[PDB]
């Protein structure tokens, strides 16, 4: 199942090292994980907490922070940013 990310999401993926414009949903999430790590948006002392305020990611999600234990913010963003091919 291939998907094509809308460009605001693609931008985040490419910044994490992704190539191209088509991906599986799993690939998208793995690049998103890479992004949060390389941009160091997580709290070192509480790594499941992501502080994305003032970052592309925060603006895309419309929030300042979130827990990767609660994927609900991510579901919303995925629905709105992935076009199934």
């Amino acid at each position, epitope marked *: 199942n291939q998907v094509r990310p809308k460009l605001p999401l693609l931008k985040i993926l490419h910044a994490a090292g992704a190539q191209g414009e088509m991906f599986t949903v*799993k690939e998208v*999430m793995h690049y*998103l994980g890479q992004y949060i790590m390389v941009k160091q948006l997580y709290d070192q002392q509480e790594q499941h907490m992501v502080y994305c305020g003032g970052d592309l990611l925060g603006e895309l999600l419309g929030r300042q922070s979130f827990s990767v234990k609660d994927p609900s913010p991510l579901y919303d963003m995925l629905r709105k940013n992935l076009v199934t091919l």
Partner: nanobody
Amino acid sequence: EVQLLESGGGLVQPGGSLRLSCAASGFTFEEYAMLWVRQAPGKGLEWVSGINARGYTTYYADSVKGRFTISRDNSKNTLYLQMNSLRTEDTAVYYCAKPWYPFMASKGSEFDYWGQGTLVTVSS
């Protein structure tokens, strides 16, 4: 391009032991927490254990606490699960898992990659 290759499964009697291995490739292993999960007959996938990238922080399900030990050797891109004092209920296909989130060592997700698994049978 992510690939995970479990091995080491087999048949043992209750009280016995096995060591599972997971050969990882297609991503930067040393950047990732890693998990073991398992599926017993007729049941949903159960998270079993996890370990941070640096290998000195570990997590265990209450069901295996004190009996299983997870470890990793990044230089060989390999994860291990040492299983001691095995019980009939540990019978399952065991899977190596890469989390989508690099620091997630304590829980599985729908977005994880798994290998094809290795079968563990404990009976008698």
